[PDB]
């Protein structure tokens, strides 16, 4: 289908607890493929996918160099932000960013993205023109005028419209083994009585790799909602995921309800019921 590349960037001041920490994580289609980190004291836990070591140290030490120059920029960013908000030097603050590109089935760029946050709050973002900015407050308004005067949107756009989509197609081809993995969930239904009048049906999905999945309870083939509770998809720890979905059925009518599972790894969506 349609693909995405994003870098997630994090830069945190640590006055006294050492010095600033910098993290840059890269994602293809929400698959982590590279991780840079100022705290990492061995490249064993600066992980990268196989098809990144495939590129040699002439794409590690270049990106390591970019990362290291990027942190000089992030260093000033954090100092300027302290000034814009008249913050003290003893406080810890967090600058974050997400940027990247969306491409279609072929590679027609569809949209570019770049946005920032300061201490968890939207700060500034590149509009979909890739030519103009939305500021969140007076701090970001200051940032916007300087980036208007320095013509930053044009350089961001050049990266997003150029380097971004052209490196993404390379990644999509070179890591397609790793990237479209797709292990299907193993599913079962459990039953939990509460009243004499009532129980709860819990539909389990376990061990599916692409974290996207949809679970749905339905009564006589009709989708249900608020009597249906959904737990947030969680990692299992073995590069796979878990999820479940519960509904409170009235005791005796259990065989009315059916759980529908949809996931990339399934030939067809599954239907399950409680089996006593």
């Amino acid at each position: 289908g349609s693909h995405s590349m994003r870098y997630f960037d994090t830069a945190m001041s640590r006055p006294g607890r050492g010095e600033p920490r910098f993290i840059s994580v890269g994602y293809v289609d929400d698959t982590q493929f590279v991780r840079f980190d100022s705290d990492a004291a061995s490249p064993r836990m600066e992980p990268r996918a196989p098809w990144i070591e495939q590129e040699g140290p002439e794409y590690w030490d270049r990106n390591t160099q970019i990362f290291k120059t990027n942190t000089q920029t992030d260093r000033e960013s954090l100092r300027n932000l302290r000034g814009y908000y008249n913050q003290s030097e003893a406080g810890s603050h967090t600058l974050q960013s997400m940027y990247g590109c969306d491409v279609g089935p072929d590679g027609r760029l569809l949209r570019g993205h770049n946005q920032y946050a300061y201490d968890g709050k939207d700060y500034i973002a590149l509009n979909e023109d890739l030519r103009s900015w939305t500021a969140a407050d007076t701090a970001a308004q200051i940032t916007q005028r300087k980036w208007e005067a320095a013509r930053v949107a044009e350089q961001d756009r050049a990266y997003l419209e150029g380097t971004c989509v052209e490196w993404l197609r390379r990644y999509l081809e070179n890591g397609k083994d790793t990237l479209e993995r797709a292990d299907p969930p193993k599913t079962h239904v459990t039953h939990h009585p509460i009243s004499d009048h009532e129980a709860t049906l819990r539909c389990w999905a376990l061990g599916f790799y692409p974290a996207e999945i949809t679970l749905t309870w339905q009564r006589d083939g009709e989708d249900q909602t608020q009597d249906t509770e959904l737990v947030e998809t969680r990692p299992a720890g073995d590069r796979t995921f878990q999820k479940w979905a519960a509904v409170v059925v009235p005791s005796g009518e259990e065989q009315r309800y059916t759980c529908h599972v949809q996931h990339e790894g399934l030939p067809k969506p599954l239907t399950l019921r409680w089996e006593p």
């Binding site: 890269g26 970019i66 990027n70 992030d74 300027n80 940027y99 500034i124 930053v152 990266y159 490196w167």
Partner: peptide
């Protein structure tokens, strides 16, 4: 690949 980022906030 990483964006080269030169302009501070």
């Amino acid at each position: 690949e990483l964006r080269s980022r030169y302009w501070a906030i």
